[PDB]
């Protein structure tokens, strides 16, 4: 009954993907590795780890000028 | 008469005058009435009430 | 919900009220039936915020209308409404929607008095009750016409007082009235003072 | 502004807060807001005089988008200039937009209108045996060209013949446009065709309507005209070779199309074999007629390349030929760099650019207008759809979910490995299976594209499908 | 709604406190408004007569076609406390609410009033000239002050710490702007009747000082409504509490009194807008390539479009906006869903879709007759991008709390991976993993089952 305060995520695997590649990155990102669908995340960086996806995905998206 | 509402004045203008007043007038009783008190005496209607107003 | 509108046919008739006195043991009685019809237009006009009050007697010389007061209030000596000629016949604390029609209800009530009793010579073998709800029918339609939508309703103030038996001239204007009121699904509420039991047209 | 106060809400509005101009009381029936700000037209297709206002707006602008209830237009200038050229002048259209619409006409819009619509058709472009004139009506306008003198030894000079679209940028940027006009009727020099069309073949009316952009005034006159692809785009080529009635000339993008081309000839118009000719590979064999018409490929023309002695005496022929009308189907790659001079070594009076895809990744497309001249028509695609003249196709967009392990390889790839990867994974194999599987049993010819030969192989070998790429045998 | 959330409020209401409220003959007449009218018929017909009537008379009066309508109205009259039921030879027997039926017996027939419906002094003016811009201008500074469009009038610190106390309209002072909740255009999308009565419940949610009671209140806005306009009135009736509402509400433009301290208040058109309801401007028009045509001229109408549209430019009659990508962000960061946005367009559509789309359902109707579709007043290329885009805003969900592992016996994790199931707060489980997450408000209730 250990009690570690971390986020927990749900989401498609390719953003698991993403947000992994993101702890390759940088170090404290996710801790442990749960599923294919729930990882737990840092709750310090949140929307730290936010504003790094929506930049990633801005690229993926086209912006009519 | 059988609704009461105020006869538009429906003045054209000053130069045009009064034209079409709305007031129907029934020859058995001289009551005047007005285009929707027409519309609906004349066919859902079936009675004048200024006919019935009259006390003969 | 939806609100709806009171129209209220009276009928005024001198010789009928006078013989429901002398049968009856009081003298007055129009009085009586008179704020019971004032109380109950407060009650209608109390059910809902936006329904509508119409009265209209039928005396002996014709029919003239109660409430609403005719277009010819001009806010001038003969205006005849609001504080013009602001009579006190009910108090003036009462709620003001109230107030308003009650109060030119009752001015309209002696008028009328005024008017029948300025023709009192005249004796009308003719009753003007069948043309007093045609003609309220028509301000039913023009209601339902112009205000987009609204329900309706009619109230029949009548007496007999065992003096008028079932009259041969009130048999088609009523049924024409029925028809009338069966299209607009307008109920026809009627209300028998008087000794004789059965008015069978009104039934 | 109109003493007008700024409101409290309008500070979000870049200096683009139009509501100094007063409504007018009979606005029910105006269907139109003019912007001052850039003149963009917003027109309401619901609203009463509804027809007038669009033909109206497409004689006088450019559609920026044509939806179902509210239609956006652009007033620029090359569509004034070919309003104007057609028989327009500036007042009356000031007129008729002030009556149209609903806010008032503001000055800057006058302003614009007048200043783009005034000095124009003052210089004139011609061709006399081969030689480029440029021709003023006013003698002075000789002195202000003083800047980029190209001069080459009733008011003219006569211009080398590869700096004529130097000449006519030169002109576009400054106040006073070229214009060449094709006057068929009054051209004796060049020998008139005996080509018409055959009394058997049917024309549509937004044929006509783009035939009346081009054909408008009394001239021929060079510019744009965009069709879909099954509208008879081909049909308005024959139609105005037909009503030039001249010399043509067609640049076709493939050999195919320049065969497909003149059966188009032989089929839809009253034109004889021997006055048709072929250039290509196989066939360089020409019209012996004073008059006649060949089709050709772009690059024959414009191939810099050591060609045949055949090949040079044809294009030797082709330069030493006053040509009346030049057709240059699918005009889009007429802006690259070899194809961009196929409108100067051939000498043609009228140039009708004709193509599908009016579109280009790089900038040029915006030069055909001094390559080919004014965008003429627009075919409304959904207009054409509805109609029954192009087919109701529903685009979709399928989202192929990216699986675990490919995406894990994809996120540290190089890029043209990049789409190596995701072109094949299997998500995408699924949908196009499940497609292929249930359109095939609504009997609907499906044609895959996928431009990459691996991958269309490695479909083809995964459904056992036919596949057609580059090198496959003819 | 608007009847539903008063009559929960007075339920809410203790019972002496209602018999208090009961006094006022204006009250009761505001409150036999709010019954539903088979209620309103009852109570009516129980108010004439001092004897008490059975339940089963009641019963036998309604058909069995509303039977359902008669429980539901019993149910509403009974948490009204407007009934004193009896239990007398076996029946019970009902009674109604002495005081109200005193104090309505009064409004009906004259009785004593002690001016609750205020007094008039027969000095008055047109309300469209001065009272009515009066009252718009007073409801358009708080509208566009809680907006956020710069302001050069801006409202009393009264509504302030009212906005600040309430659940939307979260500030910040440190930042220097004022943040709308999705409650803020909740409270955009009721018509402005039952944005009175959402902002008046939060303002009886608010006082509970002992400077101010409850009944003078619920007195003072019932009889505004019964108030008429057009017509002054003096102040002298009003308590000094019911006073310094009076300037409260002058200060929201509900009533206009001309000068501070005057003994003559006129009352806005809003106080008879409070009671009941009675091309239109904000009508706007949008197509496939997500323009935006509003007719509209009124600024609090294009100013809370400017939230989720991204403005181009406005004319005389139209409004040139774009829904971008960037306008639809700048709605979702304030908390705006996406389905709030459609049904806001769906009210808003001009009738030129309203009659394309009867159309094109007609079209659906003759091409396929064995199904029937909802009338889409606007196409559902532009839903489906606000949705793609709602979806885009939340694509990785972050729900934050704690975690148990490291379990050597099975058991142990069973246990306590059913007992958060059980609370509802476990998110995931599996015996193979040996893990199991909890949600942050479910931590320190499993910390202090683990520790005990
Ligand atoms: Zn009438
Ligand atoms: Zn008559």
């Not at chain 4, 606005?27 to 669009?54: K, M, T, V």
């Not at chain 5, 718009?136 to 009038?153: R, S």
């Not at chain 5, 005389?316 to 709030?340: F, H, K, P």
Request: proline share 4%.
């Amino acid at each position: 009954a250990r009690a570690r305060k971390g986020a927990l995520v749900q989401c498609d695997p390719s953003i698991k993907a993403l947000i992994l590649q993101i702890d390759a990155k940088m170090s404290d990102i996710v801790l442990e590795e749960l599923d294919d669908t729930h990882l737990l995340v840092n709750p310090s960086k949140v929307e730290f780890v936010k504003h790094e996806l929506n930049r990633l995905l801005s690229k993926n998206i086209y912006n009519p000028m | 008469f059988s609704c009461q509402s105020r006869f538009p004045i429906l003045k054209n203008h000053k130069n045009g005058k009064l034209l079409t007043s709305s007031r129907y007038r029934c020859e058995d009783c001289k009551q005047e009435f007005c285009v929707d008190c027409d519309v609906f005496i004349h066919e859902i209607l079936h009675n004048c009430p200024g006919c019935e107003s009259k006390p003969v | 919900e939806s609100p709806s509108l009171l129209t209220v046919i009276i009928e005024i008739a001198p010789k009928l009220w006078t013989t429901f006195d002398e049968e009856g043991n009081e003298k007055g009685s129009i009085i009586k039936v008179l704020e019971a019809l004032i109380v109950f237009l407060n009650a209608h006009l109390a059910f809902n915020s936006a329904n509508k009050v119409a009265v209209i007697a039928a005396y002996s010389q014709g029919i003239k209308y109660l409430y609403p007061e005719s277009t010819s209030a001009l806010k001038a000596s003969e205006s005849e409404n609001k504080t013009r000629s602001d009579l006190k016949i009910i108090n003036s604390d009462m709620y003001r929607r109230f107030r308003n029609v009650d109060e030119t209800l009752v001015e309209e009530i002696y008028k009328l008095f005024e008017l029948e009793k300025k023709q009192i010579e005249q004796n009308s073998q003719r009753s003007t009750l069948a043309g007093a709800m045609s003609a309220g029918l028509t301000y039913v339609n023009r209601i339902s016409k112009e205000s987009v939508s609204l329900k309706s309703r009619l109230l029949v103030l009548t007496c007999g007082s065992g003096s008028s038996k079932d009259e041969i001239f009130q048999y088609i204007p009523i049924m024409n009235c029925i028809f009338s009121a069966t299209k607009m699904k307008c109920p026809i509420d009627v209300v028998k003072i008087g000794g004789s039991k059965e008015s069978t047209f009104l039934q | 502004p109109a003493d007008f106060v700024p409101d409290s809400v309008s500070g979000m509005f870049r200096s683009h807060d139009f509501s100094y101009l007063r409504l007018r009381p009979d606005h029910a029936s105006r269907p139109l807001w003019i912007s001052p700000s850039d003149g963009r037209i917003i027109l309401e297709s619901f609203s009463p005089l509804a027809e007038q206002a669009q033909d109206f707006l497409v004689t006088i602008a450019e559609p920026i988008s044509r939806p179902s209830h509210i239609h956006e237009y652009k007033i620029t200038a090359y569509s004034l200039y070919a309003a104007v050229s057609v028989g327009l002048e500036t007042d009356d259209i000031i007129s008729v937009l002030d009556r149209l619409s609903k806010v008032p006409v503001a000055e800057s819009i006058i302003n614009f209108i007048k200043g783009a619509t005034i000095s124009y058709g003052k210089v004139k472009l011609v061709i006399k045996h081969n030689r480029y004139f440029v021709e003023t009506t006013q003698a002075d306008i000789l002195q202000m060209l003083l800047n980029d003198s190209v001069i080459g030894p009733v008011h003219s000079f006569e211009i080398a013949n590869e700096s004529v679209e130097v000449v006519k940028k030169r002109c576009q940027e400054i106040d006073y446009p070229v214009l060449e006009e094709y006057d068929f009727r009054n051209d004796h020099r060049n020998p008139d065709l005996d080509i018409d069309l055959k009394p058997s073949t049917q024309i549509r009316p937004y044929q006509e309507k783009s035939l009346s952009k081009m054909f408008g005034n009394g001239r021929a006159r060079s510019g744009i005209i965009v069709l879909p692809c099954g509208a008879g785009k081909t049909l308005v080529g024959i139609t105005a070779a037909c009503t030039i009635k001249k010399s043509v000339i067609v640049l076709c993008t493939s050999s195919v199309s320049v065969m497909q081309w003149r059966q188009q000839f032989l089929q839809w118009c009253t034109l004889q074999p021997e006055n048709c000719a072929v250039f290509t590979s196989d066939n360089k064999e020409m019209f012996q007629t004073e008059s006649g018409l060949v089709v050709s490929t772009y690059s024959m023309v414009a191939n810099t390349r050591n060609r045949s002695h055949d090949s040079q005496k044809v294009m030797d022929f082709l330069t030493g030929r006053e040509w009346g009308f030049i057709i240059l189907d699918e005009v889009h790659v007429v802006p690259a760099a070899m194809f961009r001079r196929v409108v100067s070594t051939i000498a043609a009076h009228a140039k009708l650019g004709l193509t599908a895809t009016l579109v280009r990744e790089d900038d040029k497309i915006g030069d055909l207008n001094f390559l080919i001249g004014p965008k003429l028509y627009e075919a409304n695609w959904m207009e054409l759809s509805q109609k029954g003249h192009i087919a109701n196709v529903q685009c979709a967009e399928v989202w192929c979910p990216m699986t675990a392990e490919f995406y894990q390889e994809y996120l540290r790839e190089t890029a043209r490995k990049r789409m190596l990867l995701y072109i094949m994974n299997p998500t995408k194999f699924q949908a196009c299976q499940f497609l292929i599987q249930y359109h095939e049993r609504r009997g609907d010819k499906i044609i895959v594209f996928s431009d990459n030969v691996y991958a269309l192989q490695e479909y083809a070998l995964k459904m056992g499908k036919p596949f057609i790429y580059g090198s496959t045998p003819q | 709604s608007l009847k539903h959330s008063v009559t929960q409020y007075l339920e809410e209401i203790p019972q002496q406190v209602q018999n208090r409220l009961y006094t006022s003959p204006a009250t009761c007449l505001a409150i036999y408004r709010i019954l539903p009218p088979l209620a309103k018929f009852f109570i009516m017909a129980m108010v004439f007569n001092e004897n008490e009537v059975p339940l089963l008379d009641l019963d036998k009066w309604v058909n069995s076609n509303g039977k359902l309508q008669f429980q539901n109205a019993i149910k509403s009259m009974k948490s009204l406390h407007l009934l004193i039921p009896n239990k007398s030879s076996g029946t019970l027997m009902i009674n109604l609410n002495p005081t109200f039926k005193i104090s309505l017996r009064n409004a009906l027939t004259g009785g004593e009033v002690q001016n609750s419906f205020g007094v008039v002094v027969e000095e008055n003016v047109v309300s469209l000239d001065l009272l009515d811009e009066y009252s718009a201008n007073k409801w358009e500074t708080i509208l566009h002050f809680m907006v956020g469009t710069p302001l050069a009038k801006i409202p009393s610190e009264k509504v302030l710490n009212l906005l600040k106390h309430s659940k939307l309209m979260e500030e910040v002072n440190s930042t220097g702007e004022f943040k709308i909740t999705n409650e803020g255009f909740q409270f955009l999308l009721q018509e402005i009747n039952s944005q009175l009565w959402t902002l008046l419940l939060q303002y009886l949610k608010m006082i509970e000082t002992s400077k101010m009671d409850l009944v003078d209140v619920l007195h003072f806005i019932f009889m505004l409504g019964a108030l008429e306009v057009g017509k002054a009135y003096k102040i002298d009736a009003l308590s000094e509490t019911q006073r310094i509402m009076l300037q409260d509400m002058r200060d929201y433009g509900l009533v206009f009194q001309k000068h501070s301290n005057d003994s003559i208040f006129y009352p806005t058109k809003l106080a008879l807008m409070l009671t009941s309801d009675t091309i239109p401007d904000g009508s706007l028009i949008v197509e496939t390539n997500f323009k935006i045509y509003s007719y509209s001229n009124s600024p609090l109408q294009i100013a809370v479009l400017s939230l989720f549209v991204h403005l181009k430019a406005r004319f005389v009659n139209m409004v040139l906006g774009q829904i971008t990508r960037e306008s639809i962000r700048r709605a979702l960061t304030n908390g705006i869903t996406a389905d709030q946005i459609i049904a806001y367009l769906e009210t808003h559509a001009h009738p030129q879709m309203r009659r394309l789309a009867e159309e094109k359902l007609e079209k659906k109707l003759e091409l396929d007759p064995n199904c029937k579709e909802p009338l889409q007043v606007l196409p559902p290329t532009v839903v489906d991008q606000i949705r793609l885009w709602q979806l885009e805003l939340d694509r990785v969900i972050t729900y934050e709390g704690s975690l148990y592992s490291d379990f050597e016996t099975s058991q142990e994790y069973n246990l306590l991976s059913k007992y958060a199931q059980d609370i509802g707060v476990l998110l995931w489980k599996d015996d193979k993993k040996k893990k199991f997450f909890i949600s942050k408000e479910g931590n320190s209730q499993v910390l202090d089952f683990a520790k005990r």
